[PDB]
Amino acid sequence: PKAFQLNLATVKSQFGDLPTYWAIELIKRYFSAPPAIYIPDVVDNPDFKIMVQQVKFFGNGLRPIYNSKNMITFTTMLEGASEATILEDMKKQQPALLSLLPWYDPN
């Protein structure tokens, strides 16, 4: 299949009302991204895209994240991956990934 955009604004709205950089960290946690990943704020770089590509498999090593000029392509094995389905899976996994207590309380 083809990579699709994961709109950062929709992540903020799904988990209450996160500040930009907490939503970015939540995405990095969901995709187990290395801590040496740079992702700008949308206001600072409105052209920057966070993409998600559904891949056939992961390797036995670290998650194979791909990097373009002005967009980062996160990799998932989710069947039928789309913006909505990633957002729903993030909400399922969020309790283990990052504590959003000041904004989002799943309890």
Partner 1 sequence: NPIEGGVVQVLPYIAVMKDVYHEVSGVKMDNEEVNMVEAYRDPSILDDESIALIPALDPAGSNADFFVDPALVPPYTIKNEQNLTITTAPLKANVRLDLMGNSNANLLIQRGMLEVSDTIDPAGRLKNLFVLLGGKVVKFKVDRLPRAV
Write each residue from 33 to 52 as x if it is in contact with partner 1 (CB under 8 A), else as -, in one continuous string.
Answer: -xxxxx-xx-xx--------
Write each residue from 85 to 104 as x if it is in contact with partner 1 (CB under 8 A), else as -, in one continuous string.
Answer: -----------------xx-
Q: Which of 1, 9, 21, 78 is close enough to bind partner 1 by CB under 8 A? A: 21
Collect all residues with Cβ–Cβ distance below 8 Å to 15 and sequence separation of at least 6. 23, 26, 90, 91, 94, 100, 103, 104
Cα angle vertex 41, ends 63, 58, to 5°? 10
Question: Residue 69 CA to chain centroid, in angstroms?
Answer: 18
Tell me whether residue 66 or residue 84 sits nearer to partner 1 (CB atom).
66
Using the rule CB under 8 A, is 1 a contact of partner 1?
no
